[PDB]
C-alpha cells in the first residue's frame, strides 16, 4: 500500500484475516501494522485554501 | 475560529455589524491602536414591543421615502465565428 | 388500473340559488422551500493530480480550466449565501415576545423559542431538524449564518407578527393586541368584525388543535421533509460521483498516478497521464455544470420563499392558493436545515345551506342593490347578508342603495326596504 | 457600489470573453500552439494528432463558453421577467404586495433607463411619528355593542374616539361611525362609553 497520512490509533477492532480497512467511496482509511498487529487510523493531511 | 485559523486578527467580545464575511457567524472589520478585529455578527438591535391587551400604536405623522431598485434586463451578444475561432 | 381524477360533484346550479356557509375551520398547513445548499470548493489541482510533480507540469498546458472551476463554486457559495441572507434576514431590528402571553386566548408556545434548551430553538423547529439527518481536494465550507442566528431570524419576525401585525415590515413595529390584529385579517378577507369577536374562543381553539396537528406530523411519517432531504441526497450522490471517478481509468493501463509513473519511463506514461488528466477535468466540468443548474434551481426556490416570507409572513396577501389552500390570514416562518417551513393561517368555510337570492329589490319602483352583501331569502322573508358568513340582516336603506327601476333588472322580486 | 448588479453582468461576460480568447495560447498536449508553426517543422501525416488536439481543446473551451453563456442568459431572463412584473405592477398601477415595489405601503414607481438593465424609484409611504393609546374592541351604549366600520377605537385617557389605522384622526363615536351587532357579554374587553347620534 501508499498514501500520505497521519496514523492515529483507532477503535475498529478489524478481523483476524483482515489488513487494510476502507470506508465508503472505497478509500484506504485504516491499516493494521504488520509486525504489531494493532490498528490505525489514516486520516488525510490538512489541506485548505488560504 | 469554526471556519479556520484566523491569523493577524484580534478577537473581541462586543458585536457589531458584519462588515467583511468569514463564515461561522464571525465577520472582520478595521476598526480600533488600529489593527483588524473579528467579531460575532450581530443580527440588530434588540426591540422588546410594548404589548399589551389593551394599547395600541397609531402613527401621527409620515414621510414620503423614494428608494431605488436595479434589475438586469439584458447583455451583450456574442456570435463567435466557430470555424474561424477553432481553424483560423 | 385507470387512475380516477376525483370524485364526480354535480353542483345544484340554477338562477336563483346560492350557498352561504354558516361556519368555518381555521386550517394550518405547512409548506417546505429550499433556501440554499452546501458549499462545495475542489482543489482542482490535487483532485487530478493528488501529489504528483509531472501530472502537474502536465495540467499547466490546459490553460485557466481550474481557475474557471474554483471561480463557479466560489460564485455558487457567494450566491448561497445572498440567498440565505435574503430569505431570512429581512428585518433590521431583532424583536422580542413580551413575558406575559395574553395573546387573546391563542397558544405559541409550541412555535415560540424555549430557554429551557441550549439551542435557542422552538419544539416544531427541534422536530424538523430531528428528520433531515475532507478527502481529494472536496472541502465543504460553512455558512455564514449559523443555526442560531436563523433561529434569532425566525424568532423576531414572529415576535413581529404577533405584536404589530404587518406594521413591523413597512416600517416602526406598532403594537396591537392579537385579537384586533386577528379582526384586521377577517376584514381583509371580507369578513365582518364581528364574527371573531363573536366566537373568539373558538377560533382560539381551533387555531391550537391545527397547531397540535401539525406537531403529530413531522414526527411520525418521513416524506414531509422531501424535498430538503432530495437537494442533500442529490448533493452527496454528486460528491461520490465525483470521488468515484478517480477509480476509473480512461484508457490508461491503471487509475494511479504512482503505478504508472513506476512502471513506464519519462516519455510513455506521458500519455497515459494525458488520458487521465482529460478524464477527470471532463468529470469535473461535469460536476460544475451540474451543480450551476442546482443552483440556479435553488435561487429561483430561495426567491419564491423571499417573496412569501415578504408577502404571507410581514402582510396578508389576496393572491389565491399563494400563502396556502382558502383565504390567508397570517403565516409564521419556521426554520428548517437549508431550507424554510411556512406556517399558512388560512379561512375555510365548514357549513353552507341553500337560499333563494334575488339580484336586486324593489320598493316604491325603485331598485335597490346591496351595498356590501346578497340578497337571501329563507322560504317566508327576505335577508341581507354578507358573502362569506351567514348573518341574515333586515333589508333597511342603509344597506342598500338605489339606482333605476324595477323593469332593467332581470330576476328583481318584489319586497319591502325597511326605513330607520 | 449602488450599479454594481449591472457591473458584475459586465465583468462577467468581459471575463468570459477573455478567457475564451486566452485559451488558443494554451497547447493541451501538442508541441506548440500556433498552427503555422506545427505545419511547418511536421509533416502531413505527424501534425494531424496535434491539430485533432488543439481541435479537441478548443472544442471543449467553446462547449463551456456556450454552457457558460447560456446558464447566464437564464439568469438574465429570469431577471428580465422580474423586471417587466415590476414594470407592470409598480408602475402601470398600485401593487400591495408588501416589500414587493420597494419597502413600506407603496404609493407609485417611476421607471429610469440604465445600461443593459432599468432602474425603478419607488415612492412609498413610511409611518415616521407613533403615540400609545388605551384600545377596546368594543363599545356598548344601550346593551348594543358597536364595532368601527373603518377605524379603531383610542382612548387619550378620558376620552374615546374613532380614527383610522394608518393615520391619527381622531372622530367622535356617532351612529354613523359604528355598526351594532350582538350585546355586550359576548365580546371579550369591551367598555363602556356613549354612542353619539347624528
Ligand atoms: C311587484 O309590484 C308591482 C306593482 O306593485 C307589480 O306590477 C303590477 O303587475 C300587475 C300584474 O300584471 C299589473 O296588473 C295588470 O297591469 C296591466 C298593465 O300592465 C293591466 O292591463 C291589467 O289590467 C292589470 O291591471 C299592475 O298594473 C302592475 N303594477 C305596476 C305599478 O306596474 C309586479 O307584478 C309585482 N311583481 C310580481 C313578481 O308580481
Ligand atoms: C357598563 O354598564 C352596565 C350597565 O349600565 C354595567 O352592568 C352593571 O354592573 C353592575 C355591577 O356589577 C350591576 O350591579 C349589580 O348587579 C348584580 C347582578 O349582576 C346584582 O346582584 C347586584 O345587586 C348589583 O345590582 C348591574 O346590575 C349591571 N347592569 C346591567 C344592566 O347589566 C357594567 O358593569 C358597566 N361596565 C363596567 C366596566 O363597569
Ligand atoms: C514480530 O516481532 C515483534 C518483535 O520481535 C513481536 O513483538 C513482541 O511481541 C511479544 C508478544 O506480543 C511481546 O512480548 C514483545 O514485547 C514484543 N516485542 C516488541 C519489540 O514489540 C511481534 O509479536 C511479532 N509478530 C508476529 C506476528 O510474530
Ligand atoms: C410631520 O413631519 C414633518 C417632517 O419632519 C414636519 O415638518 C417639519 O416641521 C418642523 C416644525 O415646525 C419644521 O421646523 C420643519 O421645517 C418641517 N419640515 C418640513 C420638510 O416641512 C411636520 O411638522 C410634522 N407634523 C406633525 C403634526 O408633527
Ligand atoms: C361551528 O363548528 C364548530 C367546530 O365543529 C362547532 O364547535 C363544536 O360544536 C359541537 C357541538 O356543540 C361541540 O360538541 C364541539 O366540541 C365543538 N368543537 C369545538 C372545537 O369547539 C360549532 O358548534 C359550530 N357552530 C355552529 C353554529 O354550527
Ligand atoms: C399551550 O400549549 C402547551 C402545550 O400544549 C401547554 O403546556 C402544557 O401545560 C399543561 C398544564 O400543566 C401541562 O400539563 C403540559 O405538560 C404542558 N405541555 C407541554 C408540551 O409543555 C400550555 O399550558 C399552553 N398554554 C396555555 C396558556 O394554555
Ligand atoms: C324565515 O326567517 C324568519 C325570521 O327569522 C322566520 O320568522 C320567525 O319565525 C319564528 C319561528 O316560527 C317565529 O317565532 C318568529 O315570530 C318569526 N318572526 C317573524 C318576524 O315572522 C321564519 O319563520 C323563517 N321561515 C322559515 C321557513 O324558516
Ligand atoms: C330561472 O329559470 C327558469 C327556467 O327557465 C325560469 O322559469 C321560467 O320562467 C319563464 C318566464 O317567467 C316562464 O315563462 C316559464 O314557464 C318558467 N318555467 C318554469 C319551469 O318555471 C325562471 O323564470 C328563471 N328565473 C329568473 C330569475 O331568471
Ligand atoms: C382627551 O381629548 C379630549 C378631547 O379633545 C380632551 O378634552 C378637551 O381638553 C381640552 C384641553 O384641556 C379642553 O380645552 C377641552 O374643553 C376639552 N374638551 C372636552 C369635550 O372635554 C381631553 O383633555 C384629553 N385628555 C388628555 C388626558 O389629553
Ligand atoms: C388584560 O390583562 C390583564 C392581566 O391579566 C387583565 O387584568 C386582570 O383582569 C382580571 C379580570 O378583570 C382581574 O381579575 C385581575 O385582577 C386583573 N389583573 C391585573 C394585574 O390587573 C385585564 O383585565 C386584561 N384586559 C382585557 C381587556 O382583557
Ligand atoms: C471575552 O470573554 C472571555 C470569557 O469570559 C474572557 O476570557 C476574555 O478575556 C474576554 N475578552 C475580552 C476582550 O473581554
Ligand atoms: C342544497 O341542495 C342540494 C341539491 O338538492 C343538496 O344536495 C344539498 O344538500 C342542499 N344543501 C343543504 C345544506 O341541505
Ligand atoms: C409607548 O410606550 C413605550 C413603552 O412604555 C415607550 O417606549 C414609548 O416611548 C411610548 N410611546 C410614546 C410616543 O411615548
Given at each position: 500500500?501508499?498514501?500520505?497520512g497521519?496514523?492515529?490509533?483507532?477503535?475498529?477492532?478489524?478481523?483476524?484475516?483482515?489488513?487494510?480497512?476502507?470506508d465508503?467511496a472505497?478509500t484506504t482509511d485504516?491499516?493494521?501494522?504488520?509486525?504489531?498487529?494493532?490498528?490505525?487510523?489514516i486520516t488525510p493531511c490538512?489541506f485548505?485554501?488560504? | 475560529?469554526?471556519?479556520?485559523?484566523?491569523?493577524?486578527?484580534?478577537?473581541?467580545?462586543?458585536?457589531?455589524?458584519?462588515?467583511?464575511?468569514?463564515?461561522?457567524?464571525?465577520?472582520?472589520?478595521?476598526?480600533?491602536?488600529?489593527?483588524?478585529?473579528?467579531?460575532?455578527?450581530?443580527?440588530?438591535?434588540?426591540?422588546?414591543?410594548?404589548?399589551?391587551?389593551?394599547?395600541?400604536?397609531?402613527?401621527?405623522?409620515?414621510?414620503?421615502?423614494?428608494?431605488?431598485?436595479?434589475?438586469?434586463?439584458?447583455?451583450?451578444?456574442?456570435?463567435?465565428?466557430?470555424?474561424?475561432?477553432?481553424?483560423? | 388500473?385507470?387512475?380516477?381524477?376525483?370524485?364526480?360533484?354535480?353542483?345544484?346550479?340554477?338562477?336563483?340559488?346560492?350557498?352561504?356557509?354558516?361556519?368555518?375551520?381555521?386550517?394550518?398547513?405547512?409548506?417546505?422551500?429550499?433556501?440554499?445548499?452546501?458549499?462545495?470548493?475542489?482543489?482542482?489541482?490535487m483532485y487530478?493530480?493528488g501529489?504528483?510533480?509531472?501530472?502537474?507540469?502536465?495540467?499547466?498546458?490546459?490553460?485557466?480550466?481550474?481557475?474557471?472551476?474554483?471561480?463557479?463554486?466560489?460564485?455558487?457559495?457567494?450566491?448561497?449565501?445572498?440567498?440565505?441572507?435574503?430569505?431570512?434576514?429581512?428585518?433590521?431590528?431583532?424583536?422580542?415576545?413580551?413575558?406575559?402571553?395574553?395573546?387573546?386566548?391563542?397558544?405559541?408556545?409550541?412555535?415560540?423559542?424555549?430557554?429551557?434548551?441550549?439551542?435557542?430553538?422552538?419544539?416544531?423547529?427541534?422536530?424538523?431538524?430531528?428528520?433531515?439527518?475532507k478527502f481529494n481536494g472536496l472541502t465543504?465550507?460553512?455558512?455564514?449564518?449559523?443555526?442560531?442566528?436563523?433561529?434569532?431570524?425566525?424568532?423576531?419576525?414572529?415576535?413581529?407578527?404577533?405584536?404589530?401585525?404587518?406594521?413591523?415590515?413597512?416600517?416602526?413595529?406598532?403594537?396591537?393586541?392579537?385579537?384586533?390584529?386577528?379582526?384586521?385579517?377577517?376584514?381583509?378577507?371580507?369578513?365582518?368584525?364581528?364574527?371573531?369577536?363573536?366566537?373568539?374562543?373558538?377560533?382560539?381553539?381551533?387555531?391550537?388543535?391545527?397547531?397540535?396537528?401539525?406537531?403529530?406530523?413531522?414526527?411520525?411519517?418521513?416524506?414531509?421533509?422531501?424535498?430538503?432531504?432530495?437537494?442533500?441526497?442529490?448533493?452527496?450522490?454528486?460528491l461520490?460521483?465525483?470521488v468515484?471517478?478517480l477509480?476509473?481509468?480512461?484508457?490508461?493501463?491503471?487509475?494511479?498516478?504512482?503505478?504508472?509513473?513506476?512502471?513506464?519511463?519519462?516519455?510513455?506514461?506521458?500519455?497515459?497521464?494525458?488520458?487521465?488528466?482529460?478524464?477527470?477535468?471532463?468529470?469535473?466540468?461535469?460536476?460544475?455544470?451540474?451543480?450551476?443548474?442546482?443552483?440556479?434551481?435553488?435561487?429561483?426556490?430561495?426567491?419564491?420563499?423571499?417573496?412569501?416570507?415578504?408577502?404571507?409572513?410581514?402582510?396578508?396577501?389576496?393572491?389565491?392558493?399563494?400563502?396556502?389552500?382558502?383565504?390567508?390570514?397570517?403565516?409564521?416562518?419556521?426554520?428548517?436545515?437549508?431550507?424554510?417551513?411556512?406556517?399558512?393561517?388560512?379561512?375555510?368555510?365548514?357549513?353552507?345551506?341553500?337560499?333563494?337570492?334575488?339580484?336586486?329589490?324593489?320598493?316604491?319602483?325603485?331598485?335597490?342593490?346591496?351595498?356590501?352583501?346578497?340578497?337571501?331569502?329563507?322560504?317566508?322573508?327576505?335577508?341581507?347578508?354578507?358573502?362569506?358568513?351567514?348573518?341574515?340582516?333586515?333589508?333597511?336603506?342603509?344597506?342598500?342603495?338605489?339606482?333605476?327601476?324595477?323593469?332593467?333588472?332581470?330576476?328583481?322580486?318584489?319586497?319591502?326596504?325597511?326605513?330607520?
Open positions: 500500500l501508499t498514501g500520505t497521519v496514523l492515529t490509533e483507532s477503535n475498529k477492532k478489524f478481523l483476524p484475516f483482515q489488513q487494510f480497512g476502507r465508503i472505497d485504516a491499516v493494521r501494522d504488520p509486525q504489531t498487529l494493532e490498528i490505525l487510523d490538512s485548505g485554501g488560504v | 475560529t469554526r471556519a479556520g485559523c484566523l491569523i493577524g486578527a484580534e478577537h473581541v467580545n462586543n458585536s457589531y455589524e458584519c462588515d467583511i464575511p468569514i463564515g461561522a457567524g464571525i465577520c472582520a472589520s478595521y476598526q480600533t491602536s488600529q489593527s483588524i478585529i473579528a467579531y460575532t455578527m450581530s443580527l440588530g438591535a434588540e426591540n422588546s414591543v410594548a404589548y399589551s391587551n389593551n394599547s395600541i400604536a397609531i402613527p401621527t405623522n409620515f414621510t414620503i421615502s423614494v428608494t431605488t431598485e436595479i434589475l438586469p434586463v439584458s447583455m451583450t451578444k456574442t456570435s463567435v465565428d466557430c470555424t474561424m475561432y477553432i481553424c483560423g | 388500473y385507470t387512475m380516477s381524477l376525483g370524485a364526480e360533484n354535480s353542483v345544484a346550479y340554477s338562477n336563483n340559488s346560492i350557498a352561504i356557509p354558516t361556519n368555518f375551520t381555521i386550517s394550518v398547513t405547512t409548506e417546505i422551500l429550499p433556501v440554499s445548499m452546501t458549499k462545495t470548493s475542489v482543489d482542482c489541482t487530478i493530480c501529489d504528483s510533480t509531472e501530472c502537474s507540469n502536465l495540467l499547466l498546458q490546459y490553460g485557466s480550466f481550474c481557475t474557471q472551476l474554483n471561480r463557479a463554486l466560489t460564485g455558487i457559495a457567494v450566491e448561497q449565501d445572498k440567498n440565505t441572507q435574503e430569505v431570512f434576514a429581512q428585518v433590521k431590528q431583532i424583536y422580542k415576545t413580551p413575558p406575559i402571553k395574553d395573546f387573546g386566548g391563542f397558544n405559541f408556545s409550541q412555535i415560540l423559542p424555549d430557554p429551557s434548551k441550549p439551542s435557542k430553538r422552538s419544539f416544531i423547529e427541534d422536530l424538523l431538524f430531528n428528520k433531515v439527518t465543504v465550507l460553512p455558512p455564514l449564518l449559523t443555526d442560531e442566528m436563523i433561529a434569532q431570524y425566525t424568532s423576531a419576525l414572529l415576535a413581529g407578527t404577533i405584536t404589530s401585525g404587518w406594521t413591523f415590515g413597512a416600517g416602526a413595529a406598532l403594537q396591537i393586541p392579537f385579537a384586533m390584529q386577528m379582526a384586521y385579517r377577517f376584514n381583509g378577507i371580507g369578513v365582518t368584525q364581528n364574527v371573531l369577536y363573536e366566537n373568539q374562543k373558538l377560533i382560539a381553539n381551533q387555531f391550537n388543535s391545527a397547531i397540535g396537528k401539525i406537531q403529530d406530523s413531522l414526527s411520525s411519517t418521513a416524506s414531509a421533509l422531501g424535498k430538503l432531504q432530495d437537494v442533500v441526497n442529490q448533493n452527496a450522490q454528486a461520490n460521483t465525483l468515484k471517478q477509480s476509473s481509468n480512461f484508457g490508461a493501463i491503471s487509475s494511479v498516478l504512482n503505478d504508472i509513473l513506476s512502471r513506464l519511463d519519462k516519455v510513455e506514461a506521458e500519455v497515459q497521464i494525458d488520458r487521465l488528466i482529460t478524464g477527470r477535468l471532463q468529470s469535473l466540468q461535469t460536476y460544475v455544470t451540474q451543480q450551476l443548474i442546482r443552483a440556479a434551481e435553488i435561487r429561483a426556490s430561495a426567491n419564491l420563499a423571499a417573496t412569501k416570507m415578504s408577502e404571507c409572513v410581514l402582510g396578508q396577501s389576496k393572491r389565491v392558493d399563494f400563502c396556502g389552500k382558502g383565504y390567508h390570514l397570517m403565516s409564521f416562518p419556521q426554520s428548517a436545515p437549508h431550507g424554510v417551513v411556512f406556517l399558512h393561517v388560512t379561512y375555510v368555510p365548514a357549513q353552507e345551506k341553500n337560499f333563494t337570492t334575488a339580484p336586486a329589490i324593489c320598493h316604491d319602483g325603485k331598485a335597490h342593490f346591496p351595498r356590501e352583501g346578497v340578497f337571501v331569502s329563507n322560504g317566508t322573508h327576505w335577508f341581507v347578508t354578507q358573502r362569506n358568513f351567514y348573518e341574515p340582516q333586515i333589508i333597511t336603506t342603509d344597506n342598500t342603495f338605489v339606482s333605476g327601476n324595477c323593469d332593467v333588472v332581470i330576476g328583481i322580486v318584489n319586497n319591502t326596504v325597511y326605513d330607520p
